[PDB]
Design a protein around this ligand. Structure first.
Ligand SMILES: Nc1ncnc2c1ncn2[C@@H]1O[C@H](COP(=O)(O)OP(=O)(O)OP(=O)(O)O)[C@@H](O)[C@H]1O
Ligand SMILES: Nc1ncnc2c1ncn2[C@@H]1O[C@H](COP(=O)(O)OP(=O)(O)OP(=O)(O)O)[C@@H](O)[C@H]1O
Lengths: 159, 295, 225, 295, 225
């Protein structure tokens, strides 16, 4: 009668692996609920900012020739020229800050894309290892049916 | 026969004359350098017309409902604005331009948007040429307040002054190079006179024993050909060191200002063979045609 | 078919005494001859007429190769191949070697390098200067400057030699070894116009003398004193 | 003293030799005219900078938290940065500037950037007038006693940097004029080397009869002196005719612009005796030693 | 006190024969002397040392004055007024007139302009050239090129008239009138040193003779031929 009693405690102790697999896929799902959300916000702010950076880039095409010697060419008096440099020097910093913020946002978008790809690979690996936990449970937890089937036949000489 | 017997007397002529000969180097160097500088700055002039508009031109900017959607000028809103400027006798023709042709020309007029700045930003232009560049006070201020026009550009005023100061120094450098060349072409002609003065014995003995007429002025022309090439070499060497040290404080700033065209140190190679042939031609034309009637 | 000129004149700009008027001289083959006259005879103009560096005002000049009055300027150096000349100032480059100056008269023509030096030792012994071939002419004394000047047109075979006063700058003590040089050159076969100017040397060797007086020949007999 | 003999002697020397002095008379003219042009360019630069320095004031930027306040200055910080800056020497008049005013004058006098310039981009500024704007090296270094500021961009120094295209052209013209000076000094030095070859006859006679060592040099000296004076006198004419043909046409539009102090009939003449006193001495330094050390 | 020089030499760079070795030559006032010398010996250096155009290697030069061996260069031009010299090829400027050349030496010394022309016919008649005095020297014949050179050398009252071979390209007939032309000049006012080249003209008038053979005194008696 030892052919069935040897695996009695295995059915009781085989809940820990499925519990930790469920916890691992839950942790993967709850990080999955935030990672592409953060990536979508990071790409969406740059998406809203392309329509501003290209507009300020193309804004100098309609007569914004003031970034060098040409700014005195469109000047009529020294009085309107001496105060023009005071706003020209602070305006020339504005698109420099725009290009710096654009490069920073592009680097942040590339980092968010890399993080999203790494998280997708991690979620795929977590799903792949979690599927193997419930793959063999169909024959792991069918031993209780074997125990119930041999419980009736365990009577010696029909009791 | 062998040309190596011509080399051991031009060196002796340079040994016996160290003051007339280097004045040749400097005097060809200044004229060749000024002519090359004038050619370089007039090449910068007509090279800069590709990024700008000529005097017979105008610029205007349309709205987004015509430039972006229905990019070809086929709607009646585009017709009623395009044909309205031909109701008055001031223009000659218009040009079909749209957002399809907005970024192929954006490279040449702004050397900083070839990177990913953003597509579909430049509006339609439809440039028009007017034969009367004096009614531009009110031609630009006729589209103001009218829908269908975003704004108007008229940059043709006050760029004739920058063209004027750009080509006036070219004309001045051409005049100074010309008058230096007039001062130098007979300096070529008295090289041979002072050489016949200081080498009067052997020219006066080769004609008595009998020499060929070509070989009489061969050792007066071989050193002139190499002196001309040395002069143009010192000229093209010295134009860089005045360009890169004393003059490299404005044109480097004009790249960010996008005023001049793409000008670099390789632009001199397009004119070095013409300058090389010009120097030896202006040497040999006066080194030979003087000595025809002397002997 | 001799080598001689006739009926020469040279008016230049101002005629006055335009060298000569009409001559009928004759020079044979290998015939030694003088040309004697006053100071304003125009010996140098006669030499220039013989070299055809100035065209005659009248008549023609012939050196038995062509009539040299009307030759093309192309053929003038070919005339100058067979003609050598000497002067007062010796026409010597003061920096090149003594063997370099004599070699200069043949390498200006141009041939193989062995052929220049195949004749320079063969001719340097003919003048009598057997040595000092590596000596500068400034280091050389004055008596052999004219000797190396004469030993310059002999790198080839000049059919007619002409001289314009080698003597005068040479003392009669040291012209004794240069007056007899011209007889040694004459006996080889080539002729020379020894255009002397004084009369002490005229009546010394008693050779052919052509007299002249402002273009008029005083006497011409080609014999005796 | 027999002054009139040298008058015909220099004409005899010019008649016997004209082909080298008629080239020298052109090249020393360029050699001094480039120096004169560079000197007047330096004059133009310093004159324009001096007449436009008087309207140069000083600007200071402020931090964002003190510039995001209301337009009137009522808090303790903005008077705290105001009351202790008026009690200075170079400070005479400080005008407070708001944020919203900068979006008015930079649009009305500059009809661009009207939709892309952010509102929180132009901070409040204090325009400060100084009586010594060239001596502004103290004012920018005295701003560590004033907190609440971001930076000072050296007040308004964008005038000499603006004039850099001709600041780097003046020294270029000077450097190429020293090339012509060193190319004409030796030409004057060996003028007499071919001049004496043309008049060896009477200089030998005048040496053996016993003329003075000083007096033997005057016929070789005044033929350089009068030619040098004529060289500067034709140089000023050549600069005059190139100015009135090429540069004034490029500066007639600066009359209404009023951006250059410009030149006139008197600026060329204010430096003309200064050109003579250097050109004649430049000839005479190297025409005197070339006789005492080579003849 | 006496105007003579002695004990001189000239080595230049290469000595060889260093001009003179040990001479004691003395000349008196108003003497007509010759100078016999071979062409390789050196005679023009001795006349150059009299003009102080070459520094002597030894001895002292002294004419009419104190010792001029250490003569200052400032006192060099005040010497050459009382020394005049003539050369071989006439030293004549072709552009100037005949009267211009003779009025050129006294003009550059510096005096009143009225005294310049007061002596031009006074010396032009003594040289037998008072005629065709406004002609170019090229228009003049070769027999009188020295006859303006000697008058140019005698525009003042000098002490010595040293002569570096006035003849040499003149006839023996045309040398007779110019060797005695200096004789009246000698007997009137000056001493004269006619440095000869040959020996034919030397033993003709029977005057004082000097023989110099590489700086050696060979014939010095000042009598006879
Ligand atoms: N360059 C010249 N142009 C014109 N005629 C000249 C020239 N040289 C000399 N004559 C003329 O030639 C004649 C004398 O010539 P020149 O004075 O040259 O001497 P020469 O007799 O040739 O002697 P030598 O060669 O021995 O000096 C004169 O009639 C003179 O006018
Ligand atoms: N430039 C010189 N360099 C070296 N030695 C010289 C120079 N000039 C002359 N001599 C020397 O002077 C002597 C010869 O002098 P030069 O050549 O003047 O002729 P000369 O014999 O005085 O006669 P002439 O008056 O006929 O020329 C030699 O001893 C020679 O070395």
């Amino acid at each position: 009668s030892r052919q069935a009693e040897q695996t009695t405690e295995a059915l009781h102790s085989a809940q820990l692996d499925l519990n930790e697999k469920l916890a691992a896929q839950r942790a993967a799902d709850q990080k999955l609920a935030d990672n592409r959300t953060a990536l979508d916000a990071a790409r969406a702010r740059l998406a809203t900012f392309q329509t501003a950076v290209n507009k300020v880039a193309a804004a100098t095409y309609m007569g914004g020739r003031t970034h060098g010697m040409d700014a005195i060419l469109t000047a009529e008096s020294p009085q309107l020229l001496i105060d023009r440099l005071s706003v020209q020097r602070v305006m020339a910093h504005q698109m420099s800050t725009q290009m710096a913020r654009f490069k920073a946002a592009g680097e942040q978008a590339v980092k968010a894309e890399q993080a999203a790809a790494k998280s997708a690979a991690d979620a795929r690996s977590a799903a792949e290892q979690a599927a193997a936990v419930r793959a063999n449970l169909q024959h792991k937890q069918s031993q209780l049916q074997v125990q119930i089937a041999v419980v009736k036949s365990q009577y010696v000489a029909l009791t | 026969m062998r040309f190596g017997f011509l080399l051991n007397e031009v060196l002796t002529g340079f040994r016996r004359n160290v003051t007339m000969t280097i004045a040749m180097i400097l005097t060809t160097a200044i004229s060749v350098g000024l002519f090359g500088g004038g050619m370089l700055v007039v090449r910068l002039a007509d090279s800069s017309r590709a990024i700008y508009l000529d005097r017979v031109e105008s610029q205007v900017f349309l709205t987004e409902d015509v430039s972006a959607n229905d990019s070809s000028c086929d709607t009646t809103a585009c017709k009623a604005l395009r044909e309205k400027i031909e109701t008055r006798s001031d223009v000659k023709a218009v040009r079909f331009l749209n957002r399809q042709q907005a970024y192929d020309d954006a490279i040449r007029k702004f050397p900083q948007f070839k990177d990913v700045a953003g597509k579909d930003s430049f509006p339609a232009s439809f440039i028009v040429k007017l034969e009367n560049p004096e009614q531009h006070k009110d031609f630009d201020t006729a589209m103001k307040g009218q829908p269908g026009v975003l704004d108007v550009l008229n940059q043709k005023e006050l760029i004739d002054r920058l063209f004027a100061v750009l080509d006036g120094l070219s004309n001045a450098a051409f005049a100074v190079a010309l008058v230096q060349a007039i001062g130098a072409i007979l300096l070529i002609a008295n090289m041979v006179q002072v050489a016949a003065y200081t080498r009067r014995t052997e020219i006066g003995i080769m004609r008595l024993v009998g020499a060929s007429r070509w070989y009489t002025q061969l050792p007066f022309l071989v050193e002139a050909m190499l002196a001309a090439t040395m002069g143009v070499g010192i000229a093209v060497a010295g134009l860089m060191v005045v360009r890169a040290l004393f003059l490299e404080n404005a044109l480097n700033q004009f790249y960010q200002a996008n005023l001049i065209a793409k000008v670099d140190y390789a632009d001199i190679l397009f004119i070095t063979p013409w300058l090389l042939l010009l120097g030896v031609a202006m040497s040999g034309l006066t080194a030979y045609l003087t000595l025809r009637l002397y002997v | 078919m001799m080598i001689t000129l006739d009926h020469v004149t040279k008016q230049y700009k101002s005629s006055a005494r335009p060298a000569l008027d009409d001559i009928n001289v004759k020079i044979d083959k290998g015939e030694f001859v003088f040309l004697i006259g006053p100071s304003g005879s125009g010996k140098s103009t006669f030499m220039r007429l013989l070299l055809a560096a100035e065209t005659p005002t009248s008549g023609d000049v012939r050196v038995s190769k062509f009539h040299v009055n009307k030759l093309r300027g192309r053929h003038v150096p070919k005339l100058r191949q067979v003609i050598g000349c000497v002067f007062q100032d010796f026409r010597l480059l003061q920096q090149k070697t003594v063997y370099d100056n004599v070699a200069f008269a043949l390498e200006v023509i141009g041939k193989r390098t062995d052929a220049i030096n195949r004749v320079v030792p063969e001719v340097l012994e003919t003048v009598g200067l057997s040595g000092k071939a590596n000596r500068l002419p400034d280091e050389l004394s004055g008596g052999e400057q004219q000797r190396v000047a004469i030993a310059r047109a002999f790198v080839n075979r000049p059919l007619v030699l002409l001289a314009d006063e080698p003597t005068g700058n040479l003392d009669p003590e040291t012209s004794r070894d240069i007056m007899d040089l011209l007889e040694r050159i004459n006996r080889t076969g080539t002729t020379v116009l020894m255009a002397t100017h004084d009369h002490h040397i005229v009546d010394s060797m008693r050779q052919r003398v052509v007299e002249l007086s402002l273009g008029r020949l005083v006497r011409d007999e080609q014999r005796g004193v």
